[PDB]
């Protein structure tokens, strides 16, 4: 178990140790492209409901 143990636990530990503190003290760094919000939803973090999509007919 020691083989895959070291090969998939040691580099992930060191890279995630590299990807908190150095990666946030370099300020403009890893940036996400925003999750596509859809009108029948609410924001998970702050919390307010997006009014859903409008009139459906002529289908």
């Amino acid at each position: 178990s020691i083989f895959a143990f070291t090969h998939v636990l040691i580099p992930v530990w060191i890279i995630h140790y590299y990807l908190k503190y150095h990666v946030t003290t370099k300020p403009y760094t890893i940036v996400e492209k925003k999750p596509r919000i859809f009108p029948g939803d609410t924001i998970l973090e702050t919390g307010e409901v997006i009014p859903p999509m409008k009139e459906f007919p002529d289908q």
Binding site: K34, I37, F38, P39, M53, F56
Partner: protein
């Protein structure tokens, strides 16, 4: 298609050229035929990151398709009803574009050849 053989071999007068289509002015055989509801909620179309040339007609069906695909992701083969419905809507849009083409084609042929073959 066969229309292309006719457009190249026959008279180039009666043929509307694509991507330089609008020649005859509007409200001609139209009048009072415009509602253009377009209920796609253009600000929500902006907020939800949709592709250019997907900012078009039948947008809200694409909105619902993306909504169900986000809601049931490990359901790999779930959203096919809304898929087919959105396909049907933009097939109807292709029908509309075809009919607009042939309406201007009939207008140009019939009007120009009526005028230049009786006047």
């Amino acid at each position: 298609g066969a229309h292309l053989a006719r457009r190249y071999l026959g008279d180039a007068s009666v043929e509307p050229e694509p991507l330089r289509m609008p020649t005859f002015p509007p409200d001609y055989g139209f009048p009072e035929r415009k509602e253009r509801e377009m209920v796609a909620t253009q600000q929500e179309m902006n907020d939800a990151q949709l592709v250019l040339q997907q900012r078009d007609y039948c947008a809200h069906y694409l909105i619902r398709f993306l909504k169900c695909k986000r809601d049931s992701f490990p359901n790999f083969l779930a959203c096919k009803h809304e898929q087919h419905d959105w396909d049907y809507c933009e097939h109807l849009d292709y029908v509309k574009r075809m009919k607009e083409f042939e309406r201007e084609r009939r207008l140009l042929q019939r009007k120009k050849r009526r005028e230049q073959r009786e006047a």
